[PDB]
Amino acid sequence: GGVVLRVVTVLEEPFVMVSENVLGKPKKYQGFSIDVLDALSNYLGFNYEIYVAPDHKYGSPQEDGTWNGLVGELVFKRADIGISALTITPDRENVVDFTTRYMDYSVGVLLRRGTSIQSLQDLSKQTDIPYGTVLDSAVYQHVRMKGLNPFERDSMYSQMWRMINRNNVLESQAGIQKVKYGNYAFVWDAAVLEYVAINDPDCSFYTVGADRGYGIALQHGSPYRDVFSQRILELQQSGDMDILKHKWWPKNG
Template sequence: MATWDPVHGLNGTLTDRKLENNMRGVVLRVVTVLEEPFVMVSENVLGKPKNYQGFSIDVLDALANYLGFKYEIYVAPDHKYGSQQPDGTWNGLIGELVFKRADVGLSALTITPERESVVDFTTRYMDYSVGVLLKKAEKVVDMFACLAPFDLSLWACIAGTVLLVGTLVYLLNWLNPPRLPMGSVSSTTLYNSMWFVYGSFVQQ
């Protein structure tokens, strides 16, 4: 379509054109595994070749029209996608490619590192994933939602700690009052001591 180099820059046109070395006259043997809606049998007349349809077949037909090749398609004998056996060999669709009984594999095939080590994959043209759907929870306004982080027993311990430590702070200030300027009155009360301890908890 076009080339680029640091000296001459862009050279060529960006118009779409077919490959110069096309595949006209080439017949590819394609192995597949039936999987709706990617590959399905559309007709099965006794004594005649099967006709296939589906999303992957549409992609294959588009490539065949663009590059000019023809193809013969068949289903993997064991109807499996392909996995490595204990002896190191492969079965299924991948096995047909490894043993060169087919030129192309076409199906809803998952790309895995193990399979990539023995065959070449094209760029994926569809991402397929499985998800779980849950009913959306109704929003309920709870005025006590601020208490949700801890259970009731822990909140009771915190309240008891505030009361106990607040009382101790008040008693210590009462037994050993700080030196204040002449005419000043101490603001250390039991109420203020409780708020001081509670503020220390909240600040952390």
């Protein structure tokens, strides 16, 4: 009778993916973050049940200072653990506690084959192909912060903020669909976009693009954080974290 921890997530390939099911046979989740979660579950002896953030968002600080999304679920005490493709950021570290990272994060751009965008810089220099990101996400917040900083050294960020300031989507799937079928470029996690590009049945895409990382979020003060971070470091040191990565990014495009 191990305690059942409530895990809040956002669906996002290949980090957390569902298998939908029929006739009362249980819905199951899989992916890189589920494997890491499982490695931790097996170690602490907890069970868990997963639910998706009700608003389908990662979360960002709102006009009135409250948090929504996955990060908000933690702040509002609705969950014990938050895990997805969740980017560790200083603003989020203000209201929840992150583990050490279990994988590096970077920003990429998903583009339709036949376009001629070779860099995030080129993308920002035009307005013809419209572009954007997922609302209430770390990308949105980062582009805003850098784009509004007069002392930012790369002028691309100000150009991006002009375009993005709410061209955005509610969920990454919508952004991917817009690139595929419309006239759009989608700015999102490189790890997600690499997986999407290499697995697209039509090879419709290419991508262009480690100072931030993916982390497990816990309520502030949680006694799981140190224990998790220890287990994460162990997994990295042994090569086991790399084995997990290769399972989900076996880069064979």
